Protein backbone atom coordinates (compact mmCIF):
# COMPACT_ATOMS: atom_id res chain seq x y z
CA UNK A 1 0.00 0.00 0.00
CA UNK A 2 2.59 2.60 0.50
CA UNK A 3 4.72 1.38 -2.66
CA UNK A 4 1.16 1.78 -3.97
CA UNK A 5 0.08 5.08 -2.76
CA UNK A 6 3.83 6.34 -3.69
CA UNK A 7 3.03 5.76 -7.17
CA UNK A 8 10.54 -2.38 6.35
CA UNK A 9 12.59 -0.38 8.74
CA UNK A 10 11.50 1.84 6.34
CA UNK A 11 7.93 1.84 7.75
CA UNK A 12 7.61 0.24 11.25
CA UNK A 13 8.90 2.91 12.84
CA UNK A 14 6.33 5.79 11.40
CA UNK A 15 3.97 6.89 12.94
CA UNK A 16 0.10 6.44 11.93
CA UNK A 17 -2.49 5.14 14.09
CA UNK A 18 -2.25 1.56 13.98
CA UNK A 19 -0.58 -0.88 10.90
CA UNK A 20 -3.88 -2.59 10.10
CA UNK A 21 -5.16 -3.28 6.75
CA UNK A 22 -6.91 0.13 5.93
CA UNK A 23 -6.12 2.55 8.17
CA UNK A 24 -2.92 3.62 6.67
CA UNK A 25 -4.77 4.71 3.03
CA UNK A 26 -7.35 5.64 5.16
CA UNK A 27 -5.48 8.51 6.73
CA UNK A 28 -3.33 9.52 3.50
CA UNK A 29 -6.80 10.48 1.50
CA UNK A 30 -8.42 11.98 4.38
CA UNK A 31 -5.60 14.41 4.72
CA UNK A 32 -5.11 14.80 0.95
CA UNK A 33 -8.76 15.26 1.16
CA UNK A 34 -8.65 17.53 3.49
CA UNK A 35 -5.90 19.63 2.52
CA UNK A 36 -7.08 20.02 -1.14
CA UNK A 37 -10.54 21.47 0.47
CA UNK A 38 -8.83 23.98 2.81
CA UNK A 39 -6.57 25.07 0.09
CA UNK A 40 -9.60 26.36 -2.29
CA UNK A 41 -11.34 27.24 0.56
CA UNK A 42 -8.40 29.75 1.68
CA UNK A 43 -8.33 30.94 -1.44
CA UNK A 44 -12.02 31.55 -2.11
CA UNK A 45 -12.42 33.05 1.26
CA UNK A 46 -9.50 35.54 0.69
CA UNK A 47 -11.77 37.15 -1.95
CA UNK A 48 -19.62 48.20 2.47
CA UNK A 49 -20.24 45.26 4.92
CA UNK A 50 -24.10 46.21 3.83
CA UNK A 51 -23.59 47.12 0.87
CA UNK A 52 -22.14 43.71 0.10
CA UNK A 53 -24.51 41.91 1.48
CA UNK A 54 -27.06 43.72 -0.40
CA UNK A 55 -25.85 43.19 -3.56
CA UNK A 56 -24.79 39.59 -2.94
CA UNK A 57 -28.36 39.12 -1.67
CA UNK A 58 -29.69 40.46 -5.36
CA UNK A 59 -29.33 37.40 -7.52
CA UNK A 60 -30.59 34.47 -8.96
CA UNK A 61 -31.60 31.62 -6.25
CA UNK A 62 -30.15 29.19 -8.62
CA UNK A 63 -26.87 31.19 -8.62
CA UNK A 64 -26.68 31.50 -5.37
CA UNK A 65 -27.50 28.09 -4.46
CA UNK A 66 -23.73 27.31 -6.12
CA UNK A 67 -21.78 29.99 -3.84
CA UNK A 68 -18.50 28.37 -3.78
CA UNK A 69 -17.72 29.42 -0.47
CA UNK A 70 -20.88 27.80 0.38
CA UNK A 71 -20.18 25.06 -2.37
CA UNK A 72 -16.72 24.03 0.11
CA UNK A 73 -18.26 24.30 2.93
CA UNK A 74 -20.41 21.19 3.24
CA UNK A 75 -17.33 19.24 2.06
CA UNK A 76 -15.14 20.38 4.98
CA UNK A 77 -17.68 20.13 7.44
CA UNK A 78 -18.33 16.87 6.26
CA UNK A 79 -14.29 16.04 6.14
CA UNK A 80 -13.66 16.63 9.60
CA UNK A 81 -16.19 14.08 10.62
CA UNK A 82 -14.93 11.35 8.45
CA UNK A 83 -11.76 11.80 9.37
CA UNK A 84 -12.22 12.07 13.34
CA UNK A 85 -12.61 9.79 15.62
CA UNK A 86 -15.50 7.69 16.78
CA UNK A 87 -17.37 6.99 19.76
CA UNK A 88 -16.63 10.18 21.48
CA UNK A 89 -18.19 13.18 21.14
CA UNK A 90 -16.96 15.83 19.06
CA UNK A 91 -18.45 19.12 19.56
CA UNK A 92 -19.11 21.01 16.30
CA UNK A 93 -17.45 23.95 16.55
CA UNK A 94 -17.61 24.50 12.47
CA UNK A 95 -21.31 24.35 12.85
CA UNK A 96 -21.37 26.53 16.28
CA UNK A 97 -19.35 29.33 14.09
CA UNK A 98 -21.50 28.83 10.71
CA UNK A 99 -24.49 29.30 12.58
CA UNK A 100 -23.76 33.12 14.00
CA UNK A 101 -22.18 33.88 10.60
CA UNK A 102 -25.33 32.31 9.17
CA UNK A 103 -28.16 33.45 11.31
CA UNK A 104 -27.22 37.13 12.42
CA UNK A 105 -26.71 37.91 8.15
CA UNK A 106 -30.45 36.34 8.14
CA UNK A 107 -31.75 38.89 10.49
CA UNK A 108 -29.83 42.08 9.41
CA UNK A 109 -30.66 41.30 6.21
CA UNK A 110 -34.33 40.35 6.43
CA UNK A 111 -35.12 43.40 8.91
CA UNK A 112 -33.34 45.54 6.48
CA UNK A 113 -40.96 37.02 1.71
CA UNK A 114 -37.39 35.47 2.10
CA UNK A 115 -33.58 35.92 1.59
CA UNK A 116 -31.24 34.68 -0.44
CA UNK A 117 -28.07 34.23 1.99
CA UNK A 118 -25.18 34.79 -0.24
CA UNK A 119 -21.25 34.25 0.97
CA UNK A 120 -21.93 34.99 4.64
CA UNK A 121 -18.51 35.24 5.39
CA UNK A 122 -19.01 39.21 4.62
CA UNK A 123 -19.84 40.48 7.47
CA UNK A 124 -16.93 39.23 9.95
CA UNK A 125 -15.06 41.98 8.42
CA UNK A 126 -16.37 44.95 11.54
CA UNK A 127 -17.48 44.15 14.68
CA UNK A 128 -20.84 43.38 15.99
CA UNK A 129 -21.56 46.74 17.69
CA UNK A 130 -20.65 48.78 14.52
CA UNK A 131 -23.11 46.60 12.47
CA UNK A 132 -26.08 47.50 14.45
CA UNK A 133 -25.00 50.96 14.91
CA UNK A 134 -25.00 51.19 11.21
CA UNK A 135 -28.27 49.86 10.68
CA UNK A 136 -29.56 51.32 13.53
CA UNK A 137 -28.89 55.14 12.95
CA UNK A 138 -27.96 55.03 9.04
CA UNK A 139 -30.96 53.31 7.42
CA UNK A 140 -33.61 54.66 8.77
CA UNK A 141 -34.63 51.49 10.39
CA UNK A 142 -37.03 51.80 13.67
CA UNK A 143 -35.52 50.87 17.22
CA UNK A 144 -37.75 47.96 17.56
CA UNK A 145 -38.81 45.65 14.85
CA UNK A 146 -34.70 44.85 15.33
CA UNK A 147 -34.62 44.31 19.22
CA UNK A 148 -37.59 41.94 18.04
CA UNK A 149 -36.38 39.79 15.77
CA UNK A 150 -32.77 39.58 17.60
CA UNK A 151 -35.02 37.98 20.11
CA UNK A 152 -36.44 34.85 18.20
CA UNK A 153 -32.57 33.41 17.40
CA UNK A 154 -31.02 33.29 21.01
CA UNK A 155 -28.91 36.05 20.50
CA UNK A 156 -27.99 38.97 22.91
CA UNK A 157 -26.38 41.78 21.18
CA UNK A 158 -28.23 44.02 23.01
CA UNK A 159 -30.55 46.35 21.01
CA UNK A 160 -30.44 48.93 24.10
CA UNK A 161 -26.88 48.86 24.81
CA UNK A 162 -25.41 49.43 20.98
CA UNK A 163 -27.82 52.30 20.85
CA UNK A 164 -26.33 53.92 24.36
CA UNK A 165 -22.44 53.56 23.65
CA UNK A 166 -22.70 55.21 20.33
CA UNK A 167 -24.51 58.75 20.90
CA UNK A 168 -24.53 59.21 24.78
CA UNK A 169 -21.52 59.23 26.59
CA UNK A 170 -18.58 57.53 28.26
CA UNK A 171 -19.93 56.75 32.00
CA UNK A 172 -16.96 54.78 33.74
CA UNK A 173 -17.33 53.33 37.43
CA UNK A 174 -14.26 52.02 39.13
CA UNK A 175 -13.28 51.18 42.23
CA UNK A 176 -9.37 51.25 42.64
CA UNK A 177 -9.02 54.98 41.57
CA UNK A 178 -10.69 56.42 44.33
CA UNK A 179 -9.18 55.26 47.23
CA UNK A 180 -5.35 56.33 45.15
CA UNK A 181 -7.34 59.79 44.33
CA UNK A 182 -8.45 60.85 47.89
CA UNK A 183 -4.89 60.55 49.52
CA UNK A 184 -3.87 63.06 45.96
CA UNK A 185 -6.64 65.48 46.12
CA UNK A 186 -5.89 65.81 50.18
CA UNK A 187 -2.26 66.84 49.17
CA UNK A 188 -3.73 69.07 46.06
CA UNK A 189 -6.15 71.20 47.91
CA UNK A 190 -3.96 71.40 51.12
CA UNK A 191 -0.82 72.78 48.52
CA UNK A 192 -3.63 75.21 47.41
CA UNK A 193 -4.69 75.75 50.74
CA UNK A 194 -2.24 76.91 52.80
CA UNK A 195 -0.85 79.19 49.76
CA UNK A 196 -3.63 81.22 49.77
CA UNK A 197 -4.45 81.41 53.38
CA UNK A 198 -1.32 82.37 54.47
CA UNK A 199 -2.12 85.28 53.21
CA UNK A 200 -3.41 86.17 56.42
CA UNK A 201 -1.21 89.28 56.98
CA UNK A 202 -31.77 65.49 14.06
CA UNK A 203 -31.64 64.74 18.03
CA UNK A 204 -32.53 61.12 17.86
CA UNK A 205 -35.93 59.16 17.75
CA UNK A 206 -34.81 55.94 19.95
CA UNK A 207 -35.89 57.69 22.79
CA UNK A 208 -39.13 55.44 22.06
CA UNK A 209 -37.36 52.37 22.76
CA UNK A 210 -35.40 54.18 25.26
CA UNK A 211 -38.42 55.29 27.24
CA UNK A 212 -39.96 51.99 26.50
CA UNK A 213 -37.61 49.74 28.22
CA UNK A 214 -36.39 50.47 32.09
CA UNK A 215 -36.71 54.60 32.50
CA UNK A 216 -33.83 54.95 34.45
CA UNK A 217 -31.57 54.03 31.67
CA UNK A 218 -33.44 56.69 29.94
CA UNK A 219 -32.85 59.46 32.29
CA UNK A 220 -29.34 58.97 33.19
CA UNK A 221 -29.37 58.19 28.83
CA UNK A 222 -30.81 61.83 28.62
CA UNK A 223 -27.79 62.97 31.28
CA UNK A 224 -25.20 62.70 28.71
CA UNK A 225 -30.64 69.93 22.82
CA UNK A 226 -33.73 71.91 24.28
CA UNK A 227 -35.75 69.16 23.71
CA UNK A 228 -33.73 66.87 25.51
CA UNK A 229 -33.78 69.12 28.03
CA UNK A 230 -37.35 69.21 27.76
CA UNK A 231 -37.65 65.67 28.27
CA UNK A 232 -35.38 65.37 30.91
CA UNK A 233 -37.48 67.57 32.67
CA UNK A 234 -40.55 65.34 32.90
CA UNK A 235 -38.49 61.93 33.38
CA UNK A 236 -36.90 63.50 36.21
CA UNK A 237 -40.44 65.32 37.78
CA UNK A 238 -41.74 61.44 37.82
CA UNK A 239 -38.50 61.08 40.11
CA UNK A 240 -38.71 62.60 43.45
CA UNK A 241 -35.51 60.98 45.38
CA UNK A 242 -33.06 61.08 43.00
CA UNK A 243 -33.23 65.52 42.39
CA UNK A 244 -31.71 65.29 46.13
CA UNK A 245 -28.84 63.73 45.06
CA UNK A 246 -28.78 66.00 41.82
CA UNK A 247 -28.81 68.96 44.05
CA UNK A 248 -27.16 68.40 46.52
CA UNK A 249 -24.32 67.74 44.10
CA UNK A 250 -24.89 70.96 42.14
CA UNK A 251 -24.84 73.95 44.80
CA UNK A 252 -20.73 73.50 45.63
CA UNK A 253 -19.17 73.05 42.37
CA UNK A 254 -20.90 76.06 40.07
CA UNK A 255 -23.56 77.67 42.18
CA UNK A 256 -30.10 80.79 37.45
CA UNK A 257 -31.40 78.73 34.72
CA UNK A 258 -33.12 75.32 35.93
CA UNK A 259 -32.20 72.09 37.77
CA UNK A 260 -31.70 70.42 34.89
CA UNK A 261 -31.23 72.93 32.08
CA UNK A 262 -28.09 73.25 33.14
CA UNK A 263 -26.38 69.81 33.66
CA UNK A 264 -27.42 67.87 30.84
CA UNK A 265 -24.63 68.82 27.99
CA UNK A 266 -21.94 69.77 30.03
CA UNK A 267 -18.90 68.45 31.99
CA UNK A 268 -20.58 69.53 35.26
CA UNK A 269 -22.50 66.76 34.39
CA UNK A 270 -20.20 64.08 34.11
CA UNK A 271 -18.30 64.81 37.36
CA UNK A 272 -21.31 65.23 39.64
CA UNK A 273 -22.74 61.81 39.21
CA UNK A 274 -20.06 59.64 40.45
CA UNK A 275 -18.04 61.10 42.68
CA UNK A 276 -14.05 61.09 42.87
CA UNK A 277 -14.63 57.74 40.49
CA UNK A 278 -13.71 59.68 37.25
CA UNK A 279 -10.42 59.92 35.55
CA UNK A 280 -11.07 63.48 34.80
CA UNK A 281 -12.03 64.34 38.61
CA UNK A 282 -9.55 66.25 39.45
CA UNK A 283 -9.10 69.20 37.22
CA UNK B 1 10.67 6.81 19.44
CA UNK B 2 9.09 9.39 17.57
CA UNK B 3 9.73 11.92 21.11
CA UNK B 4 13.42 11.27 21.19
CA UNK B 5 13.97 11.16 17.95
CA UNK B 6 12.46 14.70 17.02
CA UNK B 7 14.16 15.90 20.60
CA UNK B 8 17.52 15.41 18.11
CA UNK B 9 17.88 18.56 16.59
CA UNK B 10 17.20 21.72 19.41
CA UNK B 11 19.42 19.93 21.19
CA UNK B 12 22.28 18.72 18.60
CA UNK B 13 22.37 21.41 16.09
CA UNK B 14 21.97 23.78 18.76
CA UNK B 15 23.97 22.71 21.95
CA UNK B 16 27.65 21.35 21.48
CA UNK B 17 28.59 18.17 23.20
CA UNK B 18 29.69 14.87 22.74
CA UNK B 19 26.56 12.72 21.20
CA UNK B 20 27.02 10.53 23.91
CA UNK B 21 26.50 12.35 27.33
CA UNK B 22 23.46 13.56 25.68
CA UNK B 23 22.27 10.15 24.86
CA UNK B 24 22.86 9.11 28.23
CA UNK B 25 21.24 12.24 29.80
CA UNK B 26 18.02 11.62 27.75
CA UNK B 27 18.17 7.61 28.39
CA UNK B 28 18.38 8.94 32.04
CA UNK B 29 15.29 11.29 31.75
CA UNK B 30 13.15 9.05 29.79
CA UNK B 31 13.51 6.05 32.78
CA UNK B 32 11.98 9.14 34.57
CA UNK B 33 9.63 9.82 32.93
CA UNK B 34 8.45 6.03 32.78
CA UNK B 35 8.28 6.58 36.71
CA UNK B 36 5.22 9.06 35.36
CA UNK B 37 7.13 11.95 36.52
CA UNK B 38 4.60 14.64 35.50
CA UNK B 39 7.20 17.48 35.88
CA UNK B 40 9.69 15.72 34.01
CA UNK B 41 6.90 14.86 31.52
CA UNK B 42 6.07 18.28 31.44
CA UNK B 43 9.84 19.36 30.62
CA UNK B 44 10.38 16.95 27.98
CA UNK B 45 6.97 17.48 25.90
CA UNK B 46 8.28 21.67 26.63
CA UNK B 47 11.71 20.36 25.08
CA UNK B 48 9.57 18.67 22.16
CA UNK B 49 7.23 21.98 21.18
CA UNK B 50 10.55 23.95 21.30
CA UNK B 51 12.71 21.65 19.30
CA UNK B 52 9.18 20.88 17.26
CA UNK B 53 9.26 24.86 15.93
CA UNK B 54 12.82 24.87 15.48
CA UNK B 55 12.16 21.78 12.80
CA UNK B 56 9.27 23.78 11.17
CA UNK B 57 11.22 26.86 10.87
CA UNK B 58 13.93 24.53 9.00
CA UNK B 59 11.87 23.52 6.45
CA UNK B 60 11.06 27.19 5.16
CA UNK B 61 7.52 27.81 5.10
CA UNK B 62 5.07 29.38 6.49
CA UNK B 63 5.04 28.71 10.37
CA UNK B 64 1.05 27.92 10.55
CA UNK B 65 0.36 26.60 7.41
CA UNK B 66 -1.13 23.01 6.34
CA UNK B 67 2.05 20.51 6.52
CA UNK B 68 2.72 22.78 9.77
CA UNK B 69 -0.15 21.13 11.63
CA UNK B 70 0.62 17.83 9.52
CA UNK B 71 3.78 17.47 11.32
CA UNK B 72 2.64 19.37 14.59
CA UNK B 73 -0.10 16.06 14.60
CA UNK B 74 2.63 14.46 17.06
CA UNK B 75 2.50 17.36 19.84
CA UNK B 76 -0.92 16.31 20.59
CA UNK B 77 -0.26 12.40 20.20
CA UNK B 78 2.36 13.03 22.67
CA UNK B 79 0.09 14.68 24.90
CA UNK B 80 -2.66 12.84 24.73
CA UNK B 81 -0.81 9.51 24.86
CA UNK B 82 0.83 9.76 28.12
CA UNK B 83 -2.45 11.43 29.80
CA UNK B 84 -0.99 15.37 30.44
CA UNK B 85 -3.15 18.37 29.81
CA UNK B 86 -3.89 18.96 25.85
CA UNK B 87 -0.91 21.72 25.80
CA UNK B 88 -2.32 25.00 24.42
CA UNK B 89 0.86 24.39 21.29
CA UNK B 90 -0.39 26.29 17.74
CA UNK B 91 -4.04 27.68 18.65
CA UNK B 92 -2.20 30.65 20.11
CA UNK B 93 0.24 31.05 17.23
CA UNK B 94 -2.69 31.44 14.97
CA UNK B 95 -4.14 33.23 17.84
CA UNK B 96 -2.39 36.42 17.70
CA UNK B 97 -2.37 36.42 14.22
CA UNK B 98 -5.98 36.77 13.40
CA UNK B 99 -6.71 33.46 11.10
CA UNK B 100 -9.92 32.15 12.19
CA UNK B 101 -10.19 29.69 9.55
CA UNK B 102 -7.44 27.55 11.63
CA UNK B 103 -8.82 28.73 15.23
CA UNK B 104 -11.82 26.34 14.08
CA UNK B 105 -10.59 23.54 11.70
CA UNK B 106 -7.75 22.97 13.99
CA UNK B 107 -9.58 23.80 16.85
CA UNK B 108 -12.05 20.68 15.90
CA UNK B 109 -9.84 17.70 14.84
CA UNK B 110 -8.57 17.27 17.85
CA UNK B 111 -11.25 17.62 19.94
CA UNK B 112 -9.93 21.09 21.86
CA UNK B 113 -12.02 20.60 25.10
CA UNK B 114 -14.56 23.53 25.35
CA UNK B 115 -13.02 25.20 28.20
CA UNK B 116 -9.30 26.05 26.50
CA UNK B 117 -11.16 27.73 23.10
CA UNK B 118 -12.70 29.95 24.79
CA UNK B 119 -10.26 31.37 27.42
CA UNK B 120 -7.76 31.30 24.46
CA UNK B 121 -10.24 33.09 22.51
CA UNK B 122 -9.21 36.92 24.31
CA UNK B 123 -5.87 37.17 21.80
CA UNK B 124 -7.02 38.02 18.54
CA UNK B 125 -8.43 41.48 18.07
CA UNK B 126 -10.92 44.36 19.01
CA UNK B 127 -12.83 43.27 15.51
CA UNK B 128 -13.18 39.15 15.20
CA UNK B 129 -13.43 38.89 18.43
CA UNK B 130 -16.92 40.13 19.73
CA UNK B 131 -18.49 37.79 16.87
CA UNK B 132 -16.66 35.32 17.99
CA UNK B 133 -17.30 35.29 21.90
CA UNK B 134 -20.97 35.65 21.41
CA UNK B 135 -20.28 32.98 18.35
CA UNK B 136 -20.52 30.45 20.62
CA UNK B 137 -21.50 31.52 23.60
CA UNK B 138 -23.65 28.42 24.45
CA UNK B 139 -19.65 45.44 34.26
CA UNK B 140 -18.12 48.98 34.78
CA UNK B 141 -20.39 51.51 32.92
CA UNK B 142 -23.75 52.37 34.43
CA UNK B 143 -25.26 52.88 31.23
CA UNK B 144 -24.80 49.19 31.29
CA UNK B 145 -25.09 47.43 35.24
CA UNK B 146 -28.55 49.73 34.85
CA UNK B 147 -29.23 48.23 31.76
CA UNK B 148 -28.32 44.65 32.74
CA UNK B 149 -30.25 45.14 35.97
CA UNK B 150 -33.65 44.33 34.29
CA UNK B 151 -33.37 40.74 34.83
CA UNK B 152 -32.82 39.75 38.59
CA UNK B 153 -35.51 38.78 40.68
CA UNK B 154 -37.00 42.41 40.39
CA UNK B 155 -34.18 44.75 41.03
CA UNK B 156 -34.05 45.41 44.56
CA UNK B 157 -30.98 42.99 45.20
CA UNK B 158 -28.79 43.25 41.91
CA UNK B 159 -28.16 46.58 41.90
CA UNK B 160 -27.21 46.34 45.79
CA UNK B 161 -25.10 43.51 45.94
CA UNK B 162 -23.04 45.13 42.76
CA UNK B 163 -22.67 48.40 44.31
CA UNK B 164 -21.58 47.18 47.91
CA UNK B 165 -18.76 45.24 46.38
CA UNK B 166 -16.89 48.09 44.89
CA UNK B 167 -17.43 51.27 47.00
CA UNK B 168 -20.00 53.24 44.90
CA UNK B 169 -23.05 55.52 45.77
CA UNK B 170 -24.58 57.12 42.77
CA UNK B 171 -25.70 53.44 42.36
CA UNK B 172 -27.81 53.17 45.71
CA UNK B 173 -30.14 56.30 44.98
CA UNK B 174 -31.21 54.72 42.14
CA UNK B 175 -31.71 51.58 43.73
CA UNK B 176 -34.14 53.32 45.99
CA UNK B 177 -36.03 54.61 42.69
CA UNK B 178 -37.46 51.46 41.26
CA UNK B 179 -40.98 49.93 41.52
CA UNK B 180 -39.95 47.50 45.07
CA UNK B 181 -37.22 48.97 47.13
CA UNK B 182 -37.44 49.32 50.73
CA UNK B 183 -36.70 52.83 51.34
CA UNK B 184 -35.37 52.15 54.90
CA UNK B 185 -33.36 49.49 53.63
CA UNK B 186 -31.05 51.67 50.95
CA UNK B 187 -30.32 53.85 53.48
CA UNK B 188 -27.70 51.07 55.05
CA UNK B 189 -26.13 50.65 51.45
CA UNK B 190 -25.68 54.46 51.31
CA UNK B 191 -24.10 55.21 54.56
CA UNK B 192 -21.71 51.71 54.51
CA UNK B 193 -21.08 52.58 50.91
CA UNK B 194 -19.89 56.35 51.13
CA UNK B 195 -17.25 55.89 53.64
CA UNK B 196 -13.73 55.71 54.02
CA UNK B 197 -12.69 52.02 54.12
CA UNK B 198 -11.71 50.98 57.81
CA UNK B 199 -14.70 52.67 58.71
CA UNK B 200 -17.11 50.96 56.31
CA UNK B 201 -14.97 47.18 57.28
CA UNK B 202 -15.46 47.85 61.49
CA UNK B 203 -18.76 48.37 60.92
CA UNK B 204 -19.65 45.19 58.87
CA UNK B 205 -19.32 42.95 62.20
CA UNK B 206 -22.24 43.02 63.08
CA UNK B 207 -23.33 41.02 59.86
CA UNK B 208 -23.58 37.12 60.02
CA UNK B 209 -24.21 35.86 56.83
CA UNK B 210 -22.60 36.64 53.12
CA UNK B 211 -22.94 40.05 50.77
CA UNK B 212 -25.61 38.42 48.69
CA UNK B 213 -27.76 37.08 51.73
CA UNK B 214 -28.08 39.61 53.98
CA UNK B 215 -31.51 41.41 53.59
CA UNK B 216 -30.76 44.66 55.83
CA UNK B 217 -34.03 45.82 58.36
CA UNK B 218 -34.52 48.40 60.78
CA UNK B 219 -31.56 46.97 63.31
CA UNK B 220 -28.62 47.31 61.24
CA UNK B 221 -28.60 50.66 60.84
CA UNK B 222 -28.37 50.65 64.76
CA UNK B 223 -24.76 49.55 65.16
CA UNK B 224 -24.45 51.59 61.68
CA UNK B 225 -25.55 54.86 63.33
CA UNK B 226 -23.64 54.25 66.63
CA UNK B 227 -20.06 52.90 64.73
CA UNK B 228 -20.50 56.24 62.56
CA UNK B 229 -20.90 58.44 65.34
CA UNK B 230 -18.31 57.30 67.82
CA UNK B 231 -15.04 58.04 65.82
CA UNK B 232 -16.34 61.45 64.99
CA UNK B 233 -17.93 61.01 61.70
CA UNK B 234 -21.26 62.93 61.41
CA UNK B 235 -21.34 64.87 58.32
CA UNK B 236 -21.93 62.06 56.60
CA UNK B 237 -25.62 60.72 58.09
CA UNK B 238 -26.50 64.69 58.99
CA UNK B 239 -26.63 64.20 54.88
CA UNK B 240 -27.98 60.84 54.34
CA UNK B 241 -31.05 61.69 55.99
CA UNK B 242 -32.18 64.06 53.50
CA UNK B 243 -32.23 62.52 50.61
CA UNK B 244 -33.67 59.58 52.18
CA UNK B 245 -36.44 59.23 54.97
CA UNK B 246 -37.43 63.31 55.42
CA UNK B 247 -37.42 66.10 58.02
CA UNK B 248 -39.04 63.36 60.33
CA UNK B 249 -37.48 64.03 63.78
CA UNK B 250 -34.36 62.25 63.64
CA UNK B 251 -33.27 64.58 61.09
CA UNK B 252 -33.20 67.37 63.83
CA UNK B 253 -32.30 64.98 66.88
CA UNK B 254 -28.69 64.38 64.50
CA UNK B 255 -28.87 68.72 63.27
CA UNK B 256 -28.25 69.51 67.05
CA UNK B 257 -25.29 67.59 66.78
CA UNK B 258 -23.32 69.91 64.30
CA UNK B 259 -24.37 73.27 65.76
CA UNK B 260 -23.06 71.50 69.53
CA UNK B 261 -19.85 69.90 69.77
CA UNK B 262 -18.67 70.63 66.32
CA UNK B 263 -19.65 74.30 65.08
CA UNK B 264 -20.40 75.62 69.05
CA UNK B 265 -22.96 78.52 68.81
Known amino acids: ?243 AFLLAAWEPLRGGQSLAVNLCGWASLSTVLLGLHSPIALD | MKVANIILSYKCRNEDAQYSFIRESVAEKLSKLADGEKTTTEELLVLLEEGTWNSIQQQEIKRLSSESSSQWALVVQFCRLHNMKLSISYLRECAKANDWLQFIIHSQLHNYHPAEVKSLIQYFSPVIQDHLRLAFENMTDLFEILLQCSEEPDSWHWLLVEAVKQQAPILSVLASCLQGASAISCLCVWIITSVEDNVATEAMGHIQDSTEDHTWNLEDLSVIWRTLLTRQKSKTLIRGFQLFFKDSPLLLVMEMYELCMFFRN
Open chain 1, 1 to 243: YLLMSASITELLQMCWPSLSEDCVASHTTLSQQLDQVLQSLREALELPPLSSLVEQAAQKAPEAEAHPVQIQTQLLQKNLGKQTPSGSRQMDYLGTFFSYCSTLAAVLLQSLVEVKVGNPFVLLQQSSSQLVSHLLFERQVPPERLAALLAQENLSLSVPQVIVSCCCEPLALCSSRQSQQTSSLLTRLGTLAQLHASHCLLTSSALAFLKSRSKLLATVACLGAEQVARECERLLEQFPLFE
